[PDB]
């Protein structure tokens, strides 16, 4: 059980899976330790025309992964005319890489969430710093996994999948809670959705504020 | 370059050119006979190619590769008395034998070195640029068990054990000759074992018994090369009995 002291972190990557789409929110803020150097930052990338990848935790470890997944995707599409890669092979091969790098004791964690459909099935895969792949109803990794995911679990517990409206209220609730409870981040989120044409998610914008407990 | 010229071409003969050809060399230069005895398996050579100003210590036609396995050879090719080809084969086979001891102990068996040597020429047939060695060695020895063995290898690299086998100056001829002399009595008696070797050599006798060099080797023990002087003692008496059969 591990968690390296991160320098340049993306704290949170939100994710809930729906019927043909995924809605992801990705933190705008890039903390480089305590100082927040860069907000503008979208951590969700476009690999290909039917895949997307969104990661939280170290951003450096992310940028190393985006080009590598780019060369793996480039080998696979060559074979067809418009064939696109399934989520599971790329995410699982990367899992084996992180299990090996975890054993090497000086390393930095990243945890990514891939959405793709390259099969006859829409796959939601995760590669973690610890490694494993699984399906999830609603997901959050890193700092989300620790504190909001449990709030999400609470919800998930009697009602297996939430509605659209209820996920939006939670998102709004959530950003408040992260700024308040975790440090590095900001309220500021980018809303990114991936679909069968590519990933679309414009620049991170400010959203609801409340670092007030003077009112509580 | 031509198809026939190339090292690759399996030929209508149904067997690779360079393997076939190495097999047609196992007569002429030097003669090596080895017979099996209970107490000594003995190899003898005739012709070390010595003018008797040339060192006999330098030329080994009977070299002990192990401490209970020894081998004697002969072969055909261009330029007489040719120490070189035989000499590389002694060097790789002897080191390998010492390396075997280090890995898995005690004196290494007759049959194992012979298996290694036959495969050594074989692997070369796959390997780049390499033809097999044209050599047949009469691997003579005792096992760690003490079970006497007499083994022979051929140029392709198929090996068989025999009770007694002879090569060189016409392989086929010396094999045939040795079969009249061999008896089950010959193997039991220590005097007869030496004479059986000498008896095959003599049908291409050259220059005394000082030319002919014999060794006895025992169960775990180093090669003992009998004096060039001792050999002469057997030849004078035997040579007379020899004339009569052929």
């Amino acid at each position: 059980t591990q968690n390296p002291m991160v320098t340049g972190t993306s704290v949170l990557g939100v994710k809930f899976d729906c019927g043909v789409v995924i809605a992801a929110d990705m933190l705008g803020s890039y903390g480089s330790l305590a100082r927040f150097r860069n907000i503008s930052r979208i951590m969700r990338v476009n690999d290909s025309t039917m895949l997307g990848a969104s990661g939280d935790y170290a951003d450096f470890q992310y940028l190393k992964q985006v080009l590598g997944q780019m060369v793996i995707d480039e080998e696979l599409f060559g074979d067809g005319h418009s064939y696109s890669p399934r989520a599971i092979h790329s995410w699982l091969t990367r899992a084996m890489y992180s299990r090996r790098s975890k054993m090497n004791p000086l390393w930095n964690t990243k945890v990514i969430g891939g959405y793709a459909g390259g099969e006859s099935f829409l796959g939601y895969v995760d590669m973690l710093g610890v490694a494993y792949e699984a399906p999830s109803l609603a997901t959050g990794y890193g700092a989300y996994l620790a504190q909001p995911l449990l709030r999400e679990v609470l919800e998930k517990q009697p009602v297996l999948s939430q509605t659209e409206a209820r996920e939006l209220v939670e998102r709004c609730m959530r950003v408040l809670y992260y700024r308040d409870a975790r440090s590095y981040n900001r309220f500021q989120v980018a809303t990114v959705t991936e679909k069968g044409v590519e990933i679309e998610g414009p620049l991170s914008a400010q959203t609801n504020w409340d670092i007030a407990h003077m009112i509580s | 370059m031509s198809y026939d010229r190339a090292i690759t071409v399996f030929s209508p003969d149904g067997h690779l050119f360079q393997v076939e050809y190495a097999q047609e060399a196992v007569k002429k230069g030097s003669t090596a006979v080895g017979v099996r005895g209970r107490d000594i398996v003995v190899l003898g050579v005739e012709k070390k190619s010595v003018a008797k100003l040339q060192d006999e210590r330098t030329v080994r036609k009977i070299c002990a590769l192990d401490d209970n396995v020894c081998m004697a050879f002969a072969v055909v090719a261009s330029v007489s008395g040719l120490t070189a080809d035989a000499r590389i084969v002694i060097n790789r086979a002897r080191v390998e034998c010492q390396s075997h001891r280090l890995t898995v102990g005690d004196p290494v068996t007759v049959e194992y070195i012979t298996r290694y040597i036959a495969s050594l020429k074989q692997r070369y047939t796959q390997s780049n640029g390499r033809r097999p060695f044209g050599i047949s060695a009469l691997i003579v020895g005792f096992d760690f068990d003490g079970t006497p063995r007499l083994y022979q290898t051929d140029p392709s690299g198929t090996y068989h054990a025999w009770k007694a086998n002879a090569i060189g100056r016409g392989a086929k001829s010396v094999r045939e000759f040795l079969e009249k002399n061999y008896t089950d009595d010959a193997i039991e008696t220590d005097d007869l074992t030496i004479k059986l070797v000498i008896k095959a050599l003599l049908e291409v006798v050259q220059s005394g018994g000082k030319n002919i060099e014999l060794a006895v080797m025992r169960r775990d023990q180093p090669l003992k090369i009998l004096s060039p002087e001792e050999i002469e003692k057997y030849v004078a008496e035997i040579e007379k009995e020899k004339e009569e059969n052929e």
Binding site: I88, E119, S120 | -
Partner: protein, 238 residues
């Protein structure tokens, strides 16, 4: 003759003969049918034999228990690819952890078969392989031939006198998708009977059948385990 002794000797046509001579081995070798529905992929094979004291040669091979191949041509070249393919599968579950797509493997072998046709004197592999597979996408019937060119086909038949089988597949292009596991197998027998004379039809002992699809994993059926599939005997014209 002369072009194929080497490879670097190019022809006055502009096409290498070593590849063309390699295709003719495929004509010597066993007739095969490979067909797909859209849930299943069926390999219907003709077994040939050297002795009838010995069991007839299994022409469905396990590459993995989800893709299998049926071989037509040089057997030594076939087995060499069989092993190569087998390891690739093992590799794919080992790293990726899933059932290997047929599509990733035909392309990978297609890259590898090109290399010795270009290497000086070396063969193009004188074997045509029909890979029948059901992966996550659904069924694929793939052709690799001695040319590194591969086809994605719905149904094709390769091997000795398979041409006669191909004509019946064209009539029944429509029927394939529509067909069940049982039905698709009866068409493979129909296609397979064309290969053989108008004096005779199929027997249990010269037919090997390999089924992979939605219903069950890759199982190979031998000498008399073919029987429940087998029943269905259709027209052979003169």
């Amino acid at each position: 003759n002369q072009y194929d002794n080497d490879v670097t000797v190019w022809s006055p046509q502009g096409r290498i003969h070593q590849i063309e001579y390699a295709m003719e081995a495929v004509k010597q070798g066993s007739a095969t049918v490979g067909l797909k529905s859209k849930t299943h992929a069926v390999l219907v094979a003709l077994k040939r034999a050297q002795s009838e004291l010995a069991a007839h040669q299994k022409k469905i091979l396990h590459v993995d228990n989800h893709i299998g191949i049926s071989i037509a041509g040089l057997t030594a070249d076939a087995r060499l690819l069989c092993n190569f393919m087998r390891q690739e599968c093992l590799d794919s579950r080992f790293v990726f952890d899933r059932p290997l797509p047929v599509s990733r493997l035909v392309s990978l072998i297609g890259s590898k078969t090109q290399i010795p046709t270009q290497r000086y004197g070396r063969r193009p592999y004188g074997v045509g392989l029909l890979i029948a597979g059901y992966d996550d996408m659904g069924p694929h019937v793939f052709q690799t031939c001695p040319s590194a060119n591969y086809f994605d086909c719905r149904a094709m038949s390769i091997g000795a006198r398979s041409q006669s089988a191909r004509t019946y597949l064209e009539r029944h292009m429509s029927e394939f998708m529509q067909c069940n596991l049982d039905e698709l197998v009866k068409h493979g027998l129909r296609a397979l009977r064309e290969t053989l004379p108008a004096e005779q039809d199929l027997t249990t002992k010269n037919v090997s059948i390999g089924i992979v699809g939605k219903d069950l994993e890759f199982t190979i059926y031998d000498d008399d385990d073919v029987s429940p599939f087998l029943d269905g005997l259709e027209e052979r014209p003169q």
